[PDB]
Amino acid sequence: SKEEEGLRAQVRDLEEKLETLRLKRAEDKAKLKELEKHKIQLEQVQEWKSKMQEQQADLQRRLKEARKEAKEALEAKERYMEEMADTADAIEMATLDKEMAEERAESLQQEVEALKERVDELTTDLEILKAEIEEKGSDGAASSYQLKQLEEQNARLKDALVRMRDLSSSEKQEHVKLQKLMEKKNQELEVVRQQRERLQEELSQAESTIDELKEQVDAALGAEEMVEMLTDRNLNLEEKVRELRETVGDLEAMNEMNDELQENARETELELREQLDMAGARVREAQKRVEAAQETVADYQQTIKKYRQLTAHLQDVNRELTNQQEASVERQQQPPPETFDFKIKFAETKAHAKAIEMELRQMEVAQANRHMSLLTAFMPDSFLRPGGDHDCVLVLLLMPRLICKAELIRKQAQEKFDLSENCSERPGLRGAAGEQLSFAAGLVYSLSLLQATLHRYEHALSQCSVDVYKKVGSLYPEMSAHERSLDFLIELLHKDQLDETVNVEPLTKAIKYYQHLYSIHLAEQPEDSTMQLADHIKFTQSALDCMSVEVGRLRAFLQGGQEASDIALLLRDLETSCSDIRQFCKKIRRRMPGTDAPGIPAALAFGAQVSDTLLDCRKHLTWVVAVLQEVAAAAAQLIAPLAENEGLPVAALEELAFKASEQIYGTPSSSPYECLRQSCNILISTMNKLATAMQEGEYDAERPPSKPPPVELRAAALRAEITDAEGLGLKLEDRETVIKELKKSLKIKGEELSEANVRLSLLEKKLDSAAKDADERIEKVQTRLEETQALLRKKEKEFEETMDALQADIDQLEAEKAELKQRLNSQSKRTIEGIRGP
Amino acid sequence: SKEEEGLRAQVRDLEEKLETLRLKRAEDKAKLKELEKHKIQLEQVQEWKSKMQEQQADLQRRLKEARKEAKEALEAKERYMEEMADTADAIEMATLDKEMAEERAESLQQEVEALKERVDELTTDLEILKAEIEEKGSDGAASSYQLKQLEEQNARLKDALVRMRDLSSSEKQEHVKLQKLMEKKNQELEVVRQQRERLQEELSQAESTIDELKEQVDAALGAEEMVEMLTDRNLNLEEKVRELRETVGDLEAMNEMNDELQENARETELELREQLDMAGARVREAQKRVEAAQETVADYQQTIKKYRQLTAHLQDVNRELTNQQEASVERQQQPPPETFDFKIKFAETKAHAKAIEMELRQMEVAQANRHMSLLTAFMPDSFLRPGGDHDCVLVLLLMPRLICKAELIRKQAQEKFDLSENCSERPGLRGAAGEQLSFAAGLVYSLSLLQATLHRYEHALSQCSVDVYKKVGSLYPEMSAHERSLDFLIELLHKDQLDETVNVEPLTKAIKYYQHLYSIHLAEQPEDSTMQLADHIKFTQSALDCMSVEVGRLRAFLQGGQEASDIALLLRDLETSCSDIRQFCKKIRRRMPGTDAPGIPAALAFGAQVSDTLLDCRKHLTWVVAVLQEVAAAAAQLIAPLAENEGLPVAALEELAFKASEQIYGTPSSSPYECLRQSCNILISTMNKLATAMQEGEYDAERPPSKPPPVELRAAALRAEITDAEGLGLKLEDRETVIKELKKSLKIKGEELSEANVRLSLLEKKLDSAAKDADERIEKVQTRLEETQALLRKKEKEFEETMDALQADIDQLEAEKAELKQRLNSQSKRTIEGIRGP
DSSP, X not given: OHHHHHHHHHHHHHHHHHHHHHHHHHHHXXXXXXXXXXXXXXXXXXXXXXXXXXXXXXXXXXXXXXXXXXXXXXXXXXXXXXXXXXXXXXXXXXHHHXXXXXXXXXXXXXXXXXXXXXXXXXXXXXXXXXXXXHTSOSSSHHHHHHHHHHHHHHHHHHHHHHHHHHHHHHHHHHHHXXXXXXXXXXXXXXXXXXXXXXXXXXXXXXXXXXHHXXXXXXXXXXXXXXXXXXXXXXXXXXXXXXXXXXXXXXXXXXXXXXXXXXXXXXXHHXXXXXXXXXXXXXXXXXXXXXXXXXXXXXXXXXXXXXXXXXXXXXXXXXXXXXXXXXXXXXXOOSOOOOSSTHHHHHHHHHHXXXXXXXXXXXXXXXXXXXXXXXXXXXXXXXXXXXXXXXXHHHHHHHHHHHHHHHHHHHHHHHHHTTOOTTGGGOTTXXXXXXXXXXXXXXXXXXXXXXXXXXXXXXXXXXXXXXXXXXXXHHTHHHHHTXXXXXXXXXXXXXXXXXXXXXXXXXXXXXXXXXXXXXXXXXXXXXXXXXXXXXXXXXXXXXXXXXHHHHHHHHHHXXXXXXXXXXXXXXXHHHHHHHHHHHHHHHHHHHTOSSSXXXXXXXXXXXXXXXXXXXXHHHHHHHHHHHHHHHHHHHHHHHHTTSOTTOOBOHHHHHHHHHHHHHHHHOOTTOOHHHHHHHHHHHHHHHHHHHHHHHHTTTTEEOOOOOOSOHHHHHHHHHHHHHXXXXXXXXXXXXXXXXHHHHXXXXXXXXXXXXXXXXXXXXXXXXXXXXXXXXXXXXXXXXXXXXXXXXXXXXXXXXXXXXHXXXXXXHHHHHHHHHHHXXXXXXXXXXXXXXXXXX | OHHHHHHHHHHHHXXXXXXXXXXXXXXXXXXXXXXXHHHXXXXXXXXXXXXXXXXXHHHXXXXXXXXHHHHHHHHHHHHHHHHHHHHHHHHXXXXXXXXXXXXXXXXXXXXXXXXXXXXXXXHHHHHHHHHHHHHHOSOOSTHHHHHHHHHHHHHHHHHHHHHHHHHHHHHHHHHHHHHHHHHHHHHHHHHHHHHXXXXXXXXXXXXXXXHHHHHHHHHHHHHHHHHHHHHHHHHHHHHHHHHHHHHHHHHHHHHHHHHHHHHHHXXXXXXXXXXXHHHHHHHHHHXXXXXXXXXXXXXXXXXXXXXXXXXXXXXXXXXHHXXXXXXXXXXXXXXXXXXXXXXXXXXXXXXXXXXXXXXXHHHHHHHHHHHHHHHHHTSOHHHHSTTSHHHHHHHHHHHXXXXXXXXXXXXXXXXXTTOOTTXXXXXXXXXXXXXXXXXXXXXHHHHHHHHHHHHHHXXXXXXXXXXXXXXXXXXXXXXXXXXXXXXXXXXHHHTTOOSTTSOOHHHXXXXXXXXXXXHHHSTTSOOOHHHHHHHHHHHHHHHHHHHHHHHHHHHHHBOTTOTTSHHHHHHHHHHHHHHHHHHHHHHHHHTOSSSOOTTOOSEEOOOHHHHHHHHHHHHHHHHHHHHHHHHHHHHHHHHTTSOTTOOBOHHHHHHHHHHHHHHHHOOTTOOHXXXXXXXXXXXXXXXXXXXXXXXXXXXXXXXXXOOOOXXXXXXXXXXXXXXXXXXXXXXXXXXXXXXXXXXXXXHHHHHHHHHHHHHHHHHHHHHHHHHXXXXXXXXXXXXXXXXXXXXXXXXXXHHHHHHHHHHHHHXXXXXXXXXXXXXXXXHHHHHHHHHSOO
């Protein structure tokens, strides 16, 4: 199927999605781990972020402070440069003035020193005196000439003195400037050394600060480590809280179903509890129905006691009125029981016994149906096919069943409507009571007709041929369909709804059908005279009941004062005829077979003319009943609008009788009076003759039981057909076995032939080659004998040479021994014969 | 198709799995959203952190500079107010130096004036000396002093030259030592400046390190704030995990009651439904009593109709006898005719239907009997023969019939004797009431056992083989004989004569019969687990009823005041064991198959171990019931002569209990106390285990496949053969022709084989004769050969013996020759030595 392939594709698709989304949840949990890492990092960057915000603010504030304090230091320094300007400008006058004063003093001092040198220079300027001096002579003046040369050398030296004095002054000035620059440099060196020591202290402070900050970072790393291990714990707990929340939701959902389920169970327990409150009242109210039917069984039993005491007392009063043969008249042969009482227990016992009986009967019915099914399983389809032997059996059952149903309806209808011989005198025949009685009588009449027809069927099928039996059986469906009119009537009786409003169309149709079918297929079957006559009596009695009821109704329809009218006389005559025919029926019934009383024959037999007379009697009875019923129906329609004290005119009833008689008898212009009178006269004469013949024993006969019924003949044929083919199967099995054994025997004994036949060939050849082989072992053995004899002769000469050689050796040895003895003697003799010279 | 439904179920399962892990995925992806904005704003706060670290670094730079600058501005102001002081001093003593230099210049001015006066004086004196020497001309002795002054001045001037040359060189020595003190101090200042610069660089590096460490400290101060964030969160989450786990536990716990309460509600519901089914069994029993009292009203109403017809007939006879005696007229009065005119009419409207139903059922029974007689007529003789298929069908019918009769009797007996669960507390258990209850309980127990056995029979025969079916059918007369034990009991119930005096041996004895016949012919047929369990429950309940009744009777038999004895509280223990086992039976019955209620399986299936356990349970039940019944019977006819106020001693009841316990349990010297208690413990344990396994569905199964009953196959076969048996005849004709041909072929090569065998025997006559002739001309030859061979061998020892003798005979001769030779040699030597004279 294509749908299977589509479902398989969707299964694979869903399985693949389940792989992918499981793998994705695994990835997606790992990715949640990345969430929690990012959360730690975000809290770290946020904490550093806020701390950073005031760190930046604090650095800005410190920068504000440091720059403000630097600017204030600069402002102080600047107002203070102003004070510098004042004092320094005052200095540079004062040094200008001191410097002019010092330069003036130094100029005056150099002029003082040059003037002292000029005083000495003038003492040497006495050198000028040379000119006056050497012009005078030679002793003192010319001596002063050399004096003056020395004096000029002096003047020469003095100038160099002055020059180096000036140079020394310059050097002194430079000296002072140098040493007081040096004082400045010492101050600078001291300041720089102090600044170096301050920088060393500040470096030591910063450097201790680095160490202390490292220590603080270590403690705060303890805090970070504290954070990380707190966070690991916290993430585990978050996962667990989340999972527990989900589980809590699931459990809440289960608990909520369980709460409806308990509520529904509680509602059902409440419903069962007032169902038990119902049912205790139902057991009490069915038990009140039980004590009520047990009070009805009570009162039925107190009234079977009251009818038992009443029947006992009426029997004792009757037996007292009969024991009255003598004056005594005083004997009640029964002790009075009381009321319900022992009878109570009798009926509770009988109800218990009847309950047991009904359970047993239900069990029997179920058993019969089961046995029925099991048996049906065993006989073949040819039996069960439509129109087969089963349908014929069903027909044989159908007629007794139909007869029984018709009898049940007839008896119940007679009892319910109190159909009695005196129905014509019942009050209220003009109204609904008359219609009810007419309906009941007609129903009983129709049922009697049906029963007679079915009795004919039963007899004919008990004695017909097998062919007719099968033909009737083939009609079983159609002629079983008509039972279901009678079933309708029985259902109406069961519901107490059988009344004059009931439609009897189907029953009449069924009767006509059965009569017609009998006329077609069973017409020349013989009839049973005994219960042909019994059925005739029953039919006649039912027809007479109908006739009497209709006569009474028609009399009630007549207007008062018309009793001397011609129709009223006819009605009275019909009533008298009814009584007479009923008396004849009773007379015939007394001699009817069935009881082992003296004078009653075992059976009846009469000729075909008696049967024809009975048919004619039935036809006339049917005509009279039909006429009366039609007239009464029309008259009832006419009388309905009339008052109770008003009646119909004889003219109207006469017209109705004219019409009905013409329609039913078929004879135009025949008076209904003398049609009906003729029919009744024929009936009276016929029953009178029949009653006389019966009383005289003219019809007495010995009783003709049916030959083996066609069903038994057919069953014997079917069993024979089954058997001498059922045994054929066993025969076939045996012939199977025989055939297998036989052809097995064929190969076995054929290949026994083949073996024997090879053996023939072999030992024919063996006989021939046995002649051959006998010859050739004879030659073998006889060659062997020759060879052995040849050895014997061989060995015999060899023996003989060996004998001869050994004997020669023995002879030679004996001769040699004798020769040695001779030689011994001869040597001894030669010794003494050699000494004697010749 | 099966596969489409399986695929749809798998699709549904896949879909639910995807939806569950999609919802877990969805929670996870909400958390992933949480991640994914956490990552966005981690990058945002990280850009922010890095950017503002840049800004902080710039601020740190600026603040370093500003501290630098404030320090330098303060130092400049301080040096500069040092300079204010220095400048004020310079002003003051520049003014003072101006005044000193002024009077110094004035003093030198006075000196200049005096020296210019002396220069004028010397010029005048030189002019005077000029005039004097111009006057003198001739001169003497005045040229000496000036000469001396002029060497002394040449020397003085050269010495003063050298003198303040030395002074200039000393000033330059001081000035050079000074200047090199400059240069050393400037180098010292340069070195201190270099040290200061290096210190300042190192301090700058240290300050950078300090700022970075301070910032680390900042981040980790934030970390401390997380430490206490996370600590609080972690405590709260631990508490929340604990609370969520507790809520999970609470929800699980009242889910657990909700399940238990649902089970208790179902149990109470079924007890209410058992009470509703005994209210409805009282409705069905009060019905069958209303139906029984209504067909009893129908029979009594037919009886009052017969009594009414008889009383009307007797009243008509008495009234014609009263025709001459009395006739009534009566004034106005309204006593209705007969106490039940419309009471009988109402019971007629109602159970007139019941009378009709009785008649219809009777004719249905007659029709069924006739129908199955007619059908039997068509059945072959092989079917109807003793041991045939008919007997097998009759077995299949007999044994459901037996079951139905069986609890008809059980069901009536329970009602009649009011066998209830509380029979142990009924008054009068010591007397006839106890005996009646014991009889009723035992009867119900036996009937339950019989029903269980027959149920096994029904199940086995529905599924056995045809062969087993056939021998079981062959035993039909024998098992059908046992039915009228039950028929006798139904007699007794119908007559209300079923009491404790009834002999139940035929029933027990039929039960034992059926128990073999099953053990022999149906032993390895499979059992129906469901209705095995159902029968076990029913049997156990009946046994418990017997059990309780006997316990109550034994308690009633005990002496007053012996309630504390071992036997009395053993009896109490047995009573509680009964109650517990009954509760387990109810539990099991609740989930038992048979109703279309949810949770009830279609069928039950359990292994052979469970079946064996059930058998053991039944065995122990039987033992305990038998012991109690035997003890109670013996005690009852020990207590009969005792007064109502007197009781049995515990010694007597114990001694009876010991006797019964041995000869039922078969174990000598075992205390009845352990035996009974152990049996009850086994029952309770097993029965509780079964209830539990039943309650969690361990035995649930579908109904097994229906497979054709042996009767069906047989029936089919029987009917089948009937059909094919037509064609079998044609086959038999063919097989017969084959057999005739096979036999003919067998005969021909039958006497071909015989002919070959004869020829074989004849030809190997020929060989044997030919062989014999050959053999005894052959024998004749090797007789000669054997004789020659024997001669050759014989004639060969004779040579060997002889020629050994010849060898010895030569060999003696050589010895004699040797002796003569050494005699000859001795004589020869004497001849030679005698020939040389000495």
